[PDB]
Structure 1
């Protein structure tokens, strides 16, 4: 039940991780960081600071909160 990455607990540090986030992924760094996700610097691949859950292949129409919660129901952040 532990926070997987406390260095990314800050929402501002998650936002700063989004250098070179690609245009095709459609979702914004603001929306993704607010749902607890930070950029791993590879493709559109993000990870949660809380559950360590990894998400990729983002599509227009996805919601960062909704994808995060539906795939990681154990996550305390989006619970």
Structure 2
């Protein structure tokens, strides 16, 4: 199969390294802390979107909002995006 062809010839490659982080601009924590404990969220790689209490991850691009008391940034981040590089520890940029 064309598919089998592409594989045997080693043309198939994981391009995650060109898709993530979804937002290079919010790569840095400081850049994050720029635009819910700020110092905490930013530390979980989440940056504010300007709407309600809705933040987004620079890595996966996931969105979190409507934070309830007791919600620790980082814990929520991986609960909803357990496959996120930042969450996983996979290299970024």
TM-score (norm 2): 0.71
- Tell me how far 1:62 sits from its aligned partner: 0.3
Unpaired segments ≥5 residues, structure 2: 1-19, 88-93
SS of 1:41's partner is: strand
Identify, as 1 or 2, the structure richer in helix.
2
Structure 2 partner of 1:63: 72
Unpaired segments ≥5 residues, structure 1: 18-26
What is the RMSD computed on CA atoms of the aligned residues? 0.6
Structure 1 partner of 2:4: none
Residues 28-72 of structure 1: CA deviation (Å, up to 9, x unaligned): 010000000000000000000000000000011000000000100
